[PDB]
Design a binder for this molecule. Structure first.
Ligand SMILES: [Cl-]
Ligand SMILES: [Cl-]
Ligand SMILES: [Cl-]
Ligand SMILES: [Cl-]
Ligand SMILES: [Cl-]
Ligand SMILES: [Ho+3]
Ligand SMILES: [Ho+3]
Ligand SMILES: [Ho+3]
Length: 129
């Protein structure tokens, strides 16, 4: 499913991501834009052989199981495929664990490089929240 900007903001807010770990909703929408272009089916291979899945490109190296990432972990306890569903519940629950790992949203390189410090509030402009 390819979410609309405000449609994704609404979904994330409903699932409690707004202000989670102190990160405003726009930060999460921005991260999703550059990680997956709002497409829940997005998958991308990483240099180390792991793969990222879903709207927030969760890495199989530590968070989900895809059965092809040697020595990886499955800290969110779910198959990576479950992070590709039209319902973002699993991705949000897992993202909540990732952002609590210690480095906050820096866990998402794209967020650090393209969202961090910018006017992320623009990402939720015009939305009814
Ligand atoms: Cl957009
Ligand atoms: Cl915001
Ligand atoms: Cl594996
Ligand atoms: Cl959803
Ligand atoms: Cl933080
Ligand atoms: Ho990646
Ligand atoms: Ho860690
Ligand atoms: Ho409101």
């Amino acid at each position: 499913k390819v979410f609309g900007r405000c449609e994704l903001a609404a979904a994330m807010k409903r699932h409690g991501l707004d202000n989670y770990r102190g990160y405003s909703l726009g930060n999460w929408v921005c991260a999703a834009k550059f990680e997956s272009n709002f497409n829940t089916q997005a998958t991308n291979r990483n240099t180390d052989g792991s793969t990222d899945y879903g709207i927030l490109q969760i890495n199989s190296r530590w968070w989900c199981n895809d059965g092809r990432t040697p020595g990886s972990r499955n800290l969110c306890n779910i198959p990576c495929s479950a992070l590709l569903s039209s319902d973002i519940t699993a991705s949000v629950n897992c993202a909540k664990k990732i952002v609590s790992d210690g480095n906050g949203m820096n866990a998402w390189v794209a967020w650090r490089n393209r969202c961090k410090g910018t006017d992320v509030q623009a990402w939720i402009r015009g939305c009814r929240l």
